[PDB]
Amino acid sequence: GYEVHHQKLVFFAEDVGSNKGAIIGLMVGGVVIA
Amino acid sequence: GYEVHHQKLVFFAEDVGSNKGAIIGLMVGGVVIA
Amino acid sequence: GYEVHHQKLVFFAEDVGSNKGAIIGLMVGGVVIA
Amino acid sequence: GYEVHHQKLVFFAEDVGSNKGAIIGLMVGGVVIA
Amino acid sequence: GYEVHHQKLVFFAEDVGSNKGAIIGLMVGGVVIA
Amino acid sequence: GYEVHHQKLVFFAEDVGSNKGAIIGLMVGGVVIA
Amino acid sequence: GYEVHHQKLVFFAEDVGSNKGAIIGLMVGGVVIA
Amino acid sequence: GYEVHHQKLVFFAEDVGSNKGAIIGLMVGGVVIA
Amino acid sequence: GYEVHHQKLVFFAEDVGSNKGAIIGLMVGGVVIA
Amino acid sequence: GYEVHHQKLVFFAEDVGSNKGAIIGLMVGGVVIA
Amino acid sequence: GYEVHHQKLVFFAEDVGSNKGAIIGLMVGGVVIA
Amino acid sequence: GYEVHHQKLVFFAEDVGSNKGAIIGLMVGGVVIA
Amino acid sequence: GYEVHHQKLVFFAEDVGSNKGAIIGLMVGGVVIA
Amino acid sequence: GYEVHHQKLVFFAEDVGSNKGAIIGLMVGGVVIA
Amino acid sequence: GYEVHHQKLVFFAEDVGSNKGAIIGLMVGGVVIA
Amino acid sequence: GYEVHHQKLVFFAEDVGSNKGAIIGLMVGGVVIA
Amino acid sequence: GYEVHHQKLVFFAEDVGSNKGAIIGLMVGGVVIA
Amino acid sequence: GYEVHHQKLVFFAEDVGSNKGAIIGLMVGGVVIA
Amino acid sequence: GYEVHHQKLVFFAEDVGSNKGAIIGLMVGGVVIA
Amino acid sequence: GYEVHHQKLVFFAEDVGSNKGAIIGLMVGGVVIA
């Protein structure tokens, strides 16, 4: 008798308001200018 | 008797409001100017 | 008789307000100018 | 008879207000100028 | 009969107000100028 | 003058040996029997 | 003059040997029997 | 003149031997039997 | 003139031997039986 | 003229021997039976 | 159980481009010459 | 159980570009020359 | 159980660019020349 | 049980760029020349 | 049980750039020349 | 020769009598109970 | 020859009598009970 | 020859009588009970 | 020849009578009970 | 030849009578009970 419930994972965000530059969840590489 | 329920995963966001620049979920590579 | 519930993990954020520069969840490498 | 509930982990933040520079959750390497 | 509840871990912050420089949760290496 | 190179990210494995059981990269949720 | 190179991130493994049981990279939640 | 190189991050393992039990990189929550 | 190199971070292990029990890198919460 | 090199951080282990019990790097909370 | 979200109101503009004339959000009154 | 969130109001602008003229949010009155 | 969050109000601007003219948030009145 | 958070009000600006003219938040009145 | 937090008010600016003209937060009145 | 006079604008009401219950001029959003 | 006079603007009400319950001119958002 | 005069603006109310309950000119947000 | 005169602005109320309960001109946010 | 005169601004109230309960001109935030 096993019960599992209500589990959550967020990597970057749930709510992103305003981006006036650069938002990157994940980058392996690169050059970011903002 | 196993029950599993209500599990969630979010990588970047649930709600993105306003993008006035650059938003990238995931990049392997590249150049980003904003 | 096992019950597990209400577990959460956040890597970067839940709420990101305003980005006037650069926000990166995770970077393996690169150059970031802001 | 085992019950586990209400556990949370936050790596970087829950609420990020305003970014006028550079915010990086995790970096393996790189150069950051802000 | 085991019950465990209300446990939390925060690595960097819960609330980040304003970033006018550079905020890094974790860095393995790199050069940070702010 | 920005140059970025030779970097990598591995989420689960590069080399996966033989499987007689259950291997899952990512599971949001469920029941796994092996 | 910025140069960034030869860096890596491994989340679970690079080399995974044989499996007769259960191997999961990431699980948000559930029941795992081995 | 900035140069950054040869650095690494390992979250779980590089080399994982054989498995007759249960191996999980990251679990937000649940029941693991081995 | 900034040079940074040859540095490493290991969260759990580099070499994981055989497993007949339960190995978890990170658990937010739950029940582990071995 | 800044040079930084050859340094390391280990959170749990570099070499993990065989496991017949329970090994957890980090647990926010729960019940562990071995 | 009530949830209300992301309602928005803009009176004049979100983005105003270059101005070589006269831009007025609201006036009760007067004389405007461009 | 009530939750209200992210309502926003903008009267004049979020972004105002270069100005070589006359920009007025609100005036009761007067004479404006550009 | 009431939760109210992230309401925002902007009267004139969030971002004002270069100014070679006359920028006024609010005036009861007068004479403005650009 | 009431929680109210992160409400924000901006009257004139968050960011004001270079000024070679006349920038006034609020005036009851007068003569402004740029 | 009441919790109120992080409300913010900005009248003129958070960031004011270089000034070669006249910048006034609030004036009851007078003559401003740039 | 331009003459403009005695013009008027009313948004909600220039004369509000005795009422029972919430009166709201303008709402961007939320829950109103009366 | 320009003459502008006796113009008026009312947002909520120039004359508010005796009421029972919440009166709100403007709300960006929230919960109002009366 | 420009003449501007006797112009007026009222936001909430130039004359507030005897009321019972909360009166709010402007709220960005929150919970109001009356 | 510019003449501007007798202009007025009222935000909340130029004349407040005898009330019972909270009176707030402006609130960014919070909980108001009356 | 510029003449500006007899202009006025009132934020809360130029004349406050006898009230019972909290009166607040402006609050950024908090809890008000009356």
DSSP string, I3-21: EEE--EEESS-SEE--BSS
- Distance separating alpha carbons of residues C7 and I28, to the nearest angstrom: 7
DSSP string, T2-32: EEEE--EEESS-S-B---BS-EEEEEEEEEE
Q: What share of chain B is helix, strand, coil (3-state, %, to 5)?
A: 0, 70, 30
- D-E interface: how many C-beta pairs under 8 angstroms? 123
| Known binding residues of K for Zn(2+) | 2, 5-6
- Distance separating alpha carbons of residues I13 and I23, to the nearest angstrom: 11
- Distance separating alpha carbons of residues T5 and T7, to the nearest angstrom: 6
R21 Cβ contact list (under 8 Å, min separation 6): Q19, Q20, Q21, Q22, Q23, Q34, R34, S20, S21, S34
S12 Cβ contact list (under 8 Å, min separation 6): Q25, R11, R12, R13, R16, R25, S25, S26, T10, T11, T12, T13
Q: Which of N30, K28, S12, M27 is nearest to T10 (CA)?
A: S12
**CA dist S33 → O8, R3, R21 (Å):** 21, 47, 8
Burial class of residue F1, CB neighbours in 10 A (0-12, 13-18, 19+):
exposed
Q: Which of C23, F9, E19 is nearest to A24 (CA)?
A: C23
Chain S residues with beta carbon closer than 8 angstroms to that of N8: 28
Q: Which of J28, H33, N22 is nearest to D5 (CA)?
A: J28
Neighbours of L24 (CB within 10 A): 26
Residue P3: φ, ψ to 5°: -130, 125
Chain D residues with beta carbon closer than 8 angstroms to that of H7: 28-29
- Distance separating alpha carbons of residues F34 and F20, to the nearest angstrom: 9
Chain D residues with beta carbon closer than 8 angstroms to that of G10: none
R31 Cβ contact list (under 8 Å, min separation 6): M2, M4, N2, N4, Q30, Q31, Q32, Q33, S30, S31, S32
- What tokens does B27 get? 């990049």
- Distance separating alpha carbons of residues M27 and L24, to the nearest angstrom: 8
Task: Find out whether Q12 is annotated in a ligand binding site.
Answer: no
Neighbours of chain J (3+ CB pairs under 8 A): D, E, H, I
Q: How far apart are the first and last CA of chain F?
A: 53
L19 Cβ contact list (under 8 Å, min separation 6): K18, K19, M17, M18, M19, M20, M21, M22, M23, M34, N21
Per the document, the length of chain J is 34
J20 Cβ contact list (under 8 Å, min separation 6): I20, I21, I34
**Structural gaps in chain E: residues followed by a C–N separation over 2.5 Å:** none
Do residues K23 and L18 lie in contact, with contact meaning Cβ atoms separated by under 8 Å?
no
Do residues C29 and E27 lie in contact, with contact meaning Cβ atoms separated by under 8 Å?
no
Nearest CA in chain N to D16: N6
CA E11-E16-E19 angle, to 5 degrees, is: 120
Greatest CA separation for chain D = 54
3-class secondary structure, P29: strand
Check residue O7 and give left, alpha or beta (phi > 0: left; psi -120 to 50: alpha). Answer: beta
Nearest CA in chain D to E28: D28
> Which parts of chain C fold into alpha helices (H)?
none
Neighbours of O18 (CB within 10 A): 10
- What tokens does C26 get? 């995770």
